[PDB]
C-alpha cells in the first residue's frame, strides 16, 4: 500500500513542499506512505502515470493536456507552480537579439516532450534536462526554459565570468503552458479519493510553512538534499518563491485559455474537456483575479527586482 | 503500455554508468527495448516497490535482496553489477547511523552527517561513503588516510545486483534476456575505455561532473563485474551465515539465477 509519486524532473527548489511534507511527517500523520521517485527522462512521466504504473506526480499543464489527448487518462488535482515565465533563453553576444529574425539559422534546444510541431529555418535540438547547460556550452544557440530555473542557471554562468545577470535574455512566449500541477492517474483517483485528499492536506501544510518561512524551510530541505546546497539552487528558490501557488487551486481561467487556444488552433478536438478538478482540496477557494493580464506585466517587473535584490517576496 | 521500469538503488552514482550508457548509446533501442530509469528518493522504498510488482526491475545489494525474499517480497537476482565492495577507537565503542533497512537513520546522507558530526561513525562503502570523507579531509588539509573504516575484514553483503520482480521475470524472460545484453555491451565499453566512458556519462548527468564523483569512479572500477554473473560462492556464504545465525530458515533458497545471461560463465 505505498503510493508512488513521480517528480517532473530531477529534484528542484520548487519541489520543496513535497519533500518537506515527507521529512516533517505530514504524510505520516495522514496515514500515508509516499514513495517519491525521480525520472531520468522527463518524457517518461506522462506515460508512466497515465498507464497506471505510477499513481501520482508532477507535470506541466501543456503536457498534462497533451496526455489526455494522447490516450493517457491523467487528472490535475492541484497546482504547484503558477504561470512561471516561459521562453527562448539566450546569452547576449550569441548572437541573437531582441528580434525573432535573428533566430533564423540558429540552433534551438528544448526538452523533447514533443517532436515535430517555416519548418527548416531553425534547427531543433533535443536536450532533455540539459537545455541551459548546452546554451552555456554553446552547443546550442538558444533554448526553451523557465525564468526561475533555466534563466537563473544562465545567470550563474554569467556571474562567474563577471557578466551582469541581465546578459541572460529571454524571448518571451507572449497563459500558462508551464504551470506545474500535481497529477493523478484517473483510476487511482477514483479508487483512492480519500488518499489523494489526505495527500493534498499535507502538501498544503508544507506549502504554508514554505511561504511563511522560506529560509527555515530551505535549511531543512538542503539538509535532506545536499545536491541543492549551492548558490544556484538558492537563487532559483528565490525566484520560484512568487510562482508558488498558496491555495493549490487549479485556476479556471488559465485552463480555459490554453484549452480554448488549443481548440482555436485545431490541435485539440472542439469537445475536449479540461482534465482538472478542485474537488480534493479541503479548504475554501480564493476569489478570481480581477486584472489578469496586468498582473502579468507586474510580475515581470517583480521578478526583475528579485534578480537584482536577492529576496523572498510574493506578488 | 510497454515501458519497462528500472528503479535504481540510490541517487545516481558513478557505478550506475553501464545502465545509463546503455540508454544514451542506443543499446536498449537496438534490442527493441523501452527502458524508463527511475531513481529513488528513499532507498528503503526499492525492495518493496520491485517486490510488489509496481516497478519491474532495479538494483539492490545482496543482503537486502535476501531479506526481501524473507519478507514476502518475491525478487530474484538476474545479474551482478558490483561485486563485493568493501563494507572512537579501533575496537568496540558504544551515535551510529544506518540507511534505513544511538541508532540514527540517515538515509543516503550517512557520510554527510559524519563530516558534520551529527553522527560519530556510519555504515558505508569504501568506494562511495569513504571517498566522500577523504574529500572533506583534503579540503581542510588532512591525509586521505584520516577517514578510517572498521567492519572491513572479518568472518562476516553489499554486492549490488540487477534484480527482477518474480512475476515480471516469468512473463518477460526474453525482455530480461535482451536487457542484460545491452548492459553487457555497455559494461564492456566502460571496462575497455573508462575515461571516454566517463565523459559521455557526465555530459548526460552533470550532477556527477565533479572531483568527488570521478574519485569514486576510480575506486568503483575494480569492483565492477565484467561477466555480470552471480558468484555462487558469495551467495552460498551469505545465505549460509543467515541460516547458521537462525535469521533465515534452514530451507531458504538463494533467490538468484544466471540463466538469463547469454554468454559463457568464467
Swiss-Prot record, chain A:
The active site is at 63. Pathway: Cofactor biosynthesis; thiamine diphosphate biosynthesis. Keywords: Iron, Metal-binding, Pyridoxal phosphate, Thiamine biosynthesis, Transferase. One of its GO terms (molecular function) is 4-amino-5-hydroxymethyl-2-methylpyrimidine phosphate synthase activity from histidine and PLP. The modification N6-(pyridoxal phosphate)lysine is found at residue 59. Changing residue 8 to A: Unable to sustain growth in thiamine-free medium. Changing residue 63 to A: Unable to sustain growth in thiamine-free medium. A motif (CCCFC) lies at residues 175-178. Its cofactor is Fe cation. InterPro entries: NMT1/THI5, SsuA/THI5. One of its GO terms (biological process) is thiamine diphosphate biosynthetic process. Belongs to the NMT1/THI5 family. Responsible for the formation of the pyrimidine heterocycle in the thiamine biosynthesis pathway. Catalyzes the formation of hydroxymethylpyrimidine phosphate (HMP-P) from histidine and pyridoxal phosphate (PLP). The protein uses PLP and the active site histidine to form HMP-P, generating an inactive enzyme. The enzyme can only undergo a single turnover, which suggests it is a suicide enzyme. Homodimer. This is 4-amino-5-hydroxymethyl-2-methylpyrimidine phosphate synthase THI5. It comes from Saccharomyces cerevisiae (strain ATCC 204508 / S288c) (Baker's yeast).
